[PDB]
Amino acid sequence: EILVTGIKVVDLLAPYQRGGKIGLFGGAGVGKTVLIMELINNVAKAHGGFSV
Amino acid sequence: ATDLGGLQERITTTTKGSITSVQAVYVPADDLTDPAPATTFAHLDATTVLSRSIAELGIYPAVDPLDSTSRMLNPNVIGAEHYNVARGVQKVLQDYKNLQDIIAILGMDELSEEDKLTVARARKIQRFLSQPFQVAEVFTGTPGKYVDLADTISGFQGVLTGKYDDLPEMAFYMVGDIKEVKEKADKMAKDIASRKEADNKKVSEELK
Amino acid sequence: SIAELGIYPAVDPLDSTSRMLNPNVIGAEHYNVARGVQKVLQDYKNLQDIIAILGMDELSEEDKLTVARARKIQRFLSQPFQVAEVFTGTPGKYVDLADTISGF
Amino acid sequence: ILGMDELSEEDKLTVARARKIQRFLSQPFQVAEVFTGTPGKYVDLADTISGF
Amino acid sequence: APSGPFYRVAGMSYLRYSNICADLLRNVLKEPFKAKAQARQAIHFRQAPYVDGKAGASKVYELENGIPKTAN
Amino acid sequence: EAAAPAGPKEFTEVWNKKAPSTLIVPEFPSNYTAVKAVGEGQVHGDAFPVNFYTPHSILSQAQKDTVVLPGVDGYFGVKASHVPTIAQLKPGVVELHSGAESEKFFVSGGFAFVHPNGVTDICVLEAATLDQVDPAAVKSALAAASAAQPTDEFEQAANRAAIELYSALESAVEAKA
Amino acid sequence: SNQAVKQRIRAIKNIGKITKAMKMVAASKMKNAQIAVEQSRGLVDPFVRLFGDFPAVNSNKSVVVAVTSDKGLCGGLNSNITKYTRATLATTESEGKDVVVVSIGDKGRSQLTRIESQRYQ
Amino acid sequence: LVPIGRGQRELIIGDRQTGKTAVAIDAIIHQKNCNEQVPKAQRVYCVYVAVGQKRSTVAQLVKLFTQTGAMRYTIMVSATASDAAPLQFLAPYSGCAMAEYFRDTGKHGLIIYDDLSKQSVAYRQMSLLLRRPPGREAFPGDVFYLHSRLLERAAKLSKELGGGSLTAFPVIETQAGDVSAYIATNVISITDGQIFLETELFYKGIRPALNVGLSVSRVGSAAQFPGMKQVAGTLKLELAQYREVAAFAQFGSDLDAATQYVLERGARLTEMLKQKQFAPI
Amino acid sequence: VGLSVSRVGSAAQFPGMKQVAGTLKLELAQYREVAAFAQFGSDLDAATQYVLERGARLTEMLKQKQFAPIPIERQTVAVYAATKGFLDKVRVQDIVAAEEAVISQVNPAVFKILKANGKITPALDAHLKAELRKVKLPGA
Amino acid sequence: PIERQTVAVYAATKGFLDKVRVQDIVAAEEAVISQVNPAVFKILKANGKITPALDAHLKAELRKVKLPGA
Numbered sequence A: 001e002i003l004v005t006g007i008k009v010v011d012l013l014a015p016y017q018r019g020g021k022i023g024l025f026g027g028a029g030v031g032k033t034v035l036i037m038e039l040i041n042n043v044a045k046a047h048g049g050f051s052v
Numbered sequence B: 001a002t003d004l005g006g007l008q009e010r011i012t013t014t015t016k017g018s019i020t021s022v023q024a025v026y027v028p029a030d031d032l033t034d035p036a037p038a039t040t041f042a043h044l045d046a047t048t049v050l051s052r053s054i055a056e057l058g059i060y061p062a063v064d065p066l067d068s069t070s071r072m073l074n075p076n077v078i079g080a081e082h083y084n085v086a087r088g089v090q091k092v093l094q095d096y097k098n099l100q101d102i103i104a105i106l107g108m109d110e111l112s113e114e115d116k117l118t119v120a121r122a123r124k125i126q127r128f129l130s131q132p133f134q135v136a137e138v139f140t141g142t143p144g145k146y147v148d149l150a151d152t153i154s155g156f157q158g159v160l161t162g163k164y165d166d167l168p169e170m171a172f173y174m175v176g177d178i179k180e181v182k183e184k185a186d187k188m189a190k191d192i193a194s195r196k197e198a199d200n201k202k203v204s205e206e207l208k
Numbered sequence C: 001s002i003a004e005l006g007i008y009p010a011v012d013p014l015d016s017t018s019r020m021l022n023p024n025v026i027g028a029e030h031y032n033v034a035r036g037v038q039k040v041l042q043d044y045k046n047l048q049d050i051i052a053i054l055g056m057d058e059l060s061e062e063d064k065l066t067v068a069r070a071r072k073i074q075r076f077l078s079q080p081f082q083v084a085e086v087f088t089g090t091p092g093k094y095v096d097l098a099d100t101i102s103g104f
Numbered sequence D: 001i002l003g004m005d006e007l008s009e010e011d012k013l014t015v016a017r018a019r020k021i022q023r024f025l026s027q028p029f030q031v032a033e034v035f036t037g038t039p040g041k042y043v044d045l046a047d048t049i050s051g052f
Numbered sequence E: 001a002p003s004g005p006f007y008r009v010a011g012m013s014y015l016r017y018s019n020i021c022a023d024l025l026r027n028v029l030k031e032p033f034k035a036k037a038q039a040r041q042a043i044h045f046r047q048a049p050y051v052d053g054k055a056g057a058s059k060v061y062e063l064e065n066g067i068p069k070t071a072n
Numbered sequence F: 001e002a003a004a005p006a007g008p009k010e011f012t013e014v015w016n017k018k019a020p021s022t023l024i025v026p027e028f029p030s031n032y033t034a035v036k037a038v039g040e041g042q043v044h045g046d047a048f049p050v051n052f053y054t055p056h057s058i059l060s061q062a063q064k065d066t067v068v069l070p071g072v073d074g075y076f077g078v079k080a081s082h083v084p085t086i087a088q089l090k091p092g093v094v095e096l097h098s099g100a101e102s103e104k105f106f107v108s109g110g111f112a113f114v115h116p117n118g119v120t121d122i123c124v125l126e127a128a129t130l131d132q133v134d135p136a137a138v139k140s141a142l143a144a145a146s147a148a149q150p151t152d153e154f155e156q157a158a159n160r161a162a163i164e165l166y167s168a169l170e171s172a173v174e175a176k177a
Numbered sequence G: 001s002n003q004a005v006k007q008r009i010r011a012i013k014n015i016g017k018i019t020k021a022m023k024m025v026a027a028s029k030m031k032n033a034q035i036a037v038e039q040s041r042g043l044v045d046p047f048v049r050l051f052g053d054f055p056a057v058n059s060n061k062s063v064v065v066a067v068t069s070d071k072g073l074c075g076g077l078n079s080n081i082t083k084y085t086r087a088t089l090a091t092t093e094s095e096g097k098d099v100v101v102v103s104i105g106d107k108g109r110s111q112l113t114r115i116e117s118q119r120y121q
Numbered sequence H: 001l002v003p004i005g006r007g008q009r010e011l012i013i014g015d016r017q018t019g020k021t022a023v024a025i026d027a028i029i030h031q032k033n034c035n036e037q038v039p040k041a042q043r044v045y046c047v048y049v050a051v052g053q054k055r056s057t058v059a060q061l062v063k064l065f066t067q068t069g070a071m072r073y074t075i076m077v078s079a080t081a082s083d084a085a086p087l088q089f090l091a092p093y094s095g096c097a098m099a100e101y102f103r104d105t106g107k108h109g110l111i112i113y114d115d116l117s118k119q120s121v122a123y124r125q126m127s128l129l130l131r132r133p134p135g136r137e138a139f140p141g142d143v144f145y146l147h148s149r150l151l152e153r154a155a156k157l158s159k160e161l162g163g164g165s166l167t168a169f170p171v172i173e174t175q176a177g178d179v180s181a182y183i184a185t186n187v188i189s190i191t192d193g194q195i196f197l198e199t200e201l202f203y204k205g206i207r208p209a210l211n212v213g214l215s216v217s218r219v220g221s222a223a224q225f226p227g228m229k230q231v232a233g234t235l236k237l238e239l240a241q242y243r244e245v246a247a248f249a250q251f252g253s254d255l256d257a258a259t260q261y262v263l264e265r266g267a268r269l270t271e272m273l274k275q276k277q278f279a280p281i
Numbered sequence I: 001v002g003l004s005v006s007r008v009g010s011a012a013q014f015p016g017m018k019q020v021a022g023t024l025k026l027e028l029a030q031y032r033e034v035a036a037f038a039q040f041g042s043d044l045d046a047a048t049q050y051v052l053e054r055g056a057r058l059t060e061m062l063k064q065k066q067f068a069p070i071p072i073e074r075q076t077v078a079v080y081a082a083t084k085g086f087l088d089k090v091r092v093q094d095i096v097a098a099e100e101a102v103i104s105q106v107n108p109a110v111f112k113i114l115k116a117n118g119k120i121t122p123a124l125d126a127h128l129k130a131e132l133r134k135v136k137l138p139g140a
Numbered sequence J: 001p002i003e004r005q006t007v008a009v010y011a012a013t014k015g016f017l018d019k020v021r022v023q024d025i026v027a028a029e030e031a032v033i034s035q036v037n038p039a040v041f042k043i044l045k046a047n048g049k050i051t052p053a054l055d056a057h058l059k060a061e062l063r064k065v066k067l068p069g070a
C-alpha cells in the first residue's frame, strides 16, 4: 500500500511503500537529511505508531 | 555484503508487525558504483537518488527522476493513470536528457519543433518536481507545501498533454500544485506590469 | 563496430595486418589494391567527422566520390559464409584470389 | 578572420602598444654576447618599471 | 489577347524582356569584362509547386547563359 | 478615393493588436530612405541629385547639372527643376554632366524617374560604359538577328529586342571621341 | 568506460576544430557578400519613394514571401521570420482575403508548413 | 530478435532496475501457460535461484508464482542476503543440481540464477577470509572457473542420454552500463547469448529495455519458431536501419521521405516490441 | 611530425638538408594547423588553401617504400624540389612518381658535389634550379 | 565592522549607488562610509537593527553623499 509523503517527486515517480524499506541516496550536501526531516514531518506525525 | 545484508534483513515487515524504514545512504565522492552504495540498492523497496547536478540547478529536493525507482510504480498497485503520468514524465525527461549534448554545442535554435516542444515541457516538469519543504522554511523563507497525491497526478497530467505550454518556466519553480503555477504566473506577469509614479514615500516630513 | 553495421566477417580492414603484404611477396598489383582500399577507407573514417553530423553537402563532389567508393568497398568486404548458412539464409561464397583483386 | 583595418581606431594602438611591449620585454644577455656579438644589459628594477 | 508593348503582346514579361536586353549586352563586352559579367548571368535555383501541404512537383532550373529566351 | 491610409507607422498600431508583444515591429524599406519625393528642396539652383542604379552596382549618387537619358521617344535631357516624369528608357547612352567632363554609360534599357523634388533616379539593369564594348561582336550578332525569322511571337519579341539594342550600340560607338 | 571518455574527448576535440573551420568559411563568405548587399541596396529606394510603402492595405489576394536560408546551422534566423510571417498573416487577415505563401530556402518550407499548411503553394 | 533454444545459456545483463528479473519471471510464468498445452515430454520445469536478494523479494515471487500457478513446475532455491556467504556461493550449484534432475531424466529444465553477480561477491568474501590472494577487483583467480563450471552444466543432451535439456538464464548486474567489469566479461565469455537491457531505453518507454544492437543469441535462428523466423528477418533489418537513421532524427524539419520512411517504419516495430510485464504472450 | 622530437637535431644534421628542412618544418607546421580544419574542399580562403595544397605536396614527398633507404644528398634535392617550386603542379597522386622523376632526370654529378661539400653552395644552387627545370614530371 | 558593512549593502541595494559606474564603487562606498555621519553606525551597532526611525534617517544621510562622477 502506498505511503503518501506530500513530496511531488516522491509520490509520482517512486512512491514509498507503507511497510517497505526506503533508501535516500546522495553525497555530501545534496539534501538527504533535509529530505529525511521532511519525511519525519510529513509521514510520522500522521502515522499513529511509534518512531525510532 | 553480508554485514549489510545481515542488518538489513532484520528491518522488515512481518505478519505480526510492520517497520517502515527510511534510511539515508551516503555515496562516497558522488559515486554510485562504490560498493557500499551499490550493495544497499538491492535491499530497498523504494530508492530515491539525490543528485548534485540537479541541486546546483536549484531544484530541491534534488531527486534524480531517472534514477529513483520503486516497486510501487506498478500499474496494478498505484493505478493506471498514476502509472501512466509517471512513465510519461520519465519519457519527457529522458528525451531531454538525450538532447543535452547537442543543445550544449549547437544550441536551442537547431532542434526540430517536435524536439523543442519536449525541451520546453521537460524544462517545465523539471522545475515542477521541485517543492518548498516545511523544514526548509528556516533558511529559505518560502513556506512549505504538502502536496496531495491527487494534486500531483492531475498537476503532472496537465503538463504532458500541453494545457500549460503558454506559462513561463519559472512559474513551476518552488510551488505546491498546479493551482500555484497559475497564481505564480499571474504574480510574475503583474510584477513586470505593476509600476508607480513618485513611489508614495511620505517618509520626509513625518510629524513626531 | 563492423558487426554493428551488419558486415560479416567483421574484420577490421584498418587493424588487420599481415607480413605477407610486402610487394616482394604478393606482387605489386595485389599490393596496390590492398593499400588503395586501406587508403580509401581511412579517408572515409576521416570524413565521418563531418558527414555524420552535416550530411554530405559540403564536399563539392571532391571527396563525395571517395565516400561512395568506400561505402561500396565496406559492403564488398562482407561475404556470406558456408557455415553461416545455418544462421542466415544465403549460401556460402568462396572467392578466388584473382577475382577478389579485380573486383576490388 | 576579418583584418587589420577592420577593428577600431582605439584598438589599433592596443595592437601598437602591445607589439611594442613584446619587443621591449626582449633583452640581450651578457652570457650570449660571445656567440651573438652584441653586449648584454642588466636592467635595474627602477628602470623597467618606469620604462614600461 | 493582351495589349501593350511588343514584349507584353508576345507573352513576355518586363523582367524577361529587360534581362534579355541585359543578357545581350553582356555578351558584347571586352573579355576582361565579359568574364566578369559572366558571373552575374548564371541562374541556379529550383522550384516545386506545393499543392496539399507538403507534397510538391519540383521544377529544378538551370542556366549559365542567362534568361531562357524561349517561351515558358 | 483615399479610404485606406496604410503606411509604415500605420502598420505599427494594428500590428500591436494582433501579434505577440515580445516581437518588435518589423522594419520597412521606407525606413532606410533618407530622400523622399514630395518634400521641398534638393534643387540647389542648377545642381540636382541624380542616382544611377543597377542591380549589381551603384554607378553614381552625386549631384549633376543635367543628365541626358535615352527615352523610348528619344534622348531627352533633364535640367534641375524638370517636370516630374517616369520615362521608360531604350537601349541607349546615359550622359551625366557636371561641367567640362562627362561620363557616358551605354545602358541596356530601364526606367528613369524625375521626382517632384528634383531627384532623378536612373534605374537600368546593365550599364556598360563605352570604353569596354567589343566593337567586333556588335555586327556578328546583328547579322544573325536580322536573319532569324521565327513564326512564334516570343523569339521575334526577343529578336526585335535583339537588333534594337545592337543597332543603338554601333550608333553610339562610331561618332565619339 | 575509461576509454568511453577517451573517445568522447577526441570527438569533441574535432567538433571544436570543425566548427572553427565552419566559422572562418562563414566569415570569408560574409565579407565578400557584404560588398554585394550595398550595391544591391541602391536600386531598392527609387521605387519606395515612387510607390511609397503601404504594408497594411486592403488587398483581396496576396503572395507573402518569407525568404530564409538553405542550410540550417545559422542559429535562429529562419525561425525568426516565420515568427514574423505569422505576425503579418494575422495582421493582414481582417477582411477574409486570399493568401499564397512562398518560401525561399529549404529552411522556410520546413517551418512554414508547421504553421501554415494550406495556403502554402 | 534474440531467440533462445532448449539447452542454451542466455545471459540477462543490465543495470539495476532495468527489467532483468522481469524478463526471467516472464520466462517462468510462460512455461506454465505452455505446459498445459504440450505432452509430458515437452514440459519445462523451472528453477529460480535467488542469490543475495531479500526475503521480501523472494516471498513476493512465491506469492506471484502461486497466483499464476507456476509453483507446480517451479523450484525456488533461496539463499538471501542474511544467509552465510558459503550458502550464497553454493545455491547456484544447489539449484542446478535440482534442475539437473530434469535434464538427466529426459525432461526439460529452466534454471535462472538471479544475481550471479551476487554469488561472486559471496565467493570473493569466502576466499579473502581463507587468505587466498586477491586479483582484479579483489576477486579470486578462479572466479571464471566458479562460473564456467556452473554454466556448462546447462546442456541439451543426446538421445542416448534421454535427450533432456537444461536452459540457463544467468543474471548479471552491471554498474552504469560498464560491461567491461571483471565478472561481466567472464560470464559474457561463457554464455551463448546476452540479453542486454539498458536503462536509458527503459526510460524512453521501451520496456523490456532490450538493446537490440548489443543483444546476441549464439544459437540464433537455428532454434527459432518458424513463422516467427519468417517475419524476424525484416524485423531485424528494419531495426538495423532505424538505428543508423537515429542521431540524424533531431531535425524533423529536414524531411527526406526515404530515410523518413524507415524512421517511422522502425518506430512501428520499436513500439511493437513493448510489452507489459507478468503477461507473457 | 607534431609529436616526434629530436632534441639534439638543432644544428646536428646534414648542412645541405638543414637549408631546406627548416622551411619544411614550418610549412608542415602551418599545414598541421589547417589540415583538420579544411577537411572539406568547398569554401576556402586564398591563403589557407595554399597552405593546404603545399602541405599535401610535402606529405607525399616524405613517404617512401620499405627496405630502400636513400642517400642524404638524394633526399636533400627531393625536399629542395618540394620546399622550393618545381612541384606545385602535380596534384597529390603524382608526387611519389614526381620525385622519382627528379632522382632519375637530374644530372647525378650534382649529387657528387652536394655530398662532398655538404651544403647547397650558390654555384650549385644556380645549377639546381636549372637542373630541376629540364625534368619531365609525370603530371600529364 | 559589521555596521559599516550593512550600511554599504544598504547603499547598494536601495539604489543609492545606481548610475555610479562599475569601476569606482570601491571608491564610491569608501565615500559612503566616510561621509555619512558616524552616529548611524553607532545607533545601528547598538540596536542591532535598522529601526523605522533609522532607515528614514539613513535614507536621508545617503542622499547627501558626494558620489564620484554623478
Ligand SMILES: Nc1ncnc2c1ncn2[C@@H]1O[C@H](COP(=O)(O)OP(=O)(O)OP(=O)(O)O)[C@@H](O)[C@H]1O
Pocket (backbone or CB within 6 Å): B042, B070, B071, B072, B073, B074, H015, H016, H017, H018, H019, H020, H021, H022, H023, H173, H207, H208, H275, H276, H277
Ligand atoms: N516490461 C515492463 N513493463 C513495465 N514495467 C516493467 C517491465 N519490466 C520491468 N518493469 C518494472 O521495472 C521495475 C524493476 O524491476 P526489475 O524487474 O527491473 O528487476 P531487476 O532489474 O532485477 O531489479 P534490481 O535492480 O532489483 O536487480 C519493476 O518495478 C518492474 O515492475
Ligand SMILES: Nc1ncnc2c1ncn2[C@@H]1O[C@H](COP(=O)(O)OP(=O)(O)O)[C@@H](O)[C@H]1O
Pocket (backbone or CB within 6 Å): A026, A027, A028, A029, A030, A031, A032, A033, A034, A035, B060, B061, B133, B136, B140
Ligand atoms: N529541500 C531543500 N531546500 C533548500 N535547500 C536544501 C534542501 N535540501 C538541501 N538543501 C541544502 O543542502 C544543504 C545540505 O543538505 P543536508 O540535508 O545537510 O545534506 P547531507 O545530509 O546530504 O549533507 C542544506 O544546508 C541546504 O542548504
Ligand SMILES: [Mg+2]
Pocket (backbone or CB within 6 Å): A032, A033
Ligand atoms: Mg546529513
Ligand SMILES: [Mg+2]
Pocket (backbone or CB within 6 Å): H020, H021, H114
Ligand atoms: Mg532482480
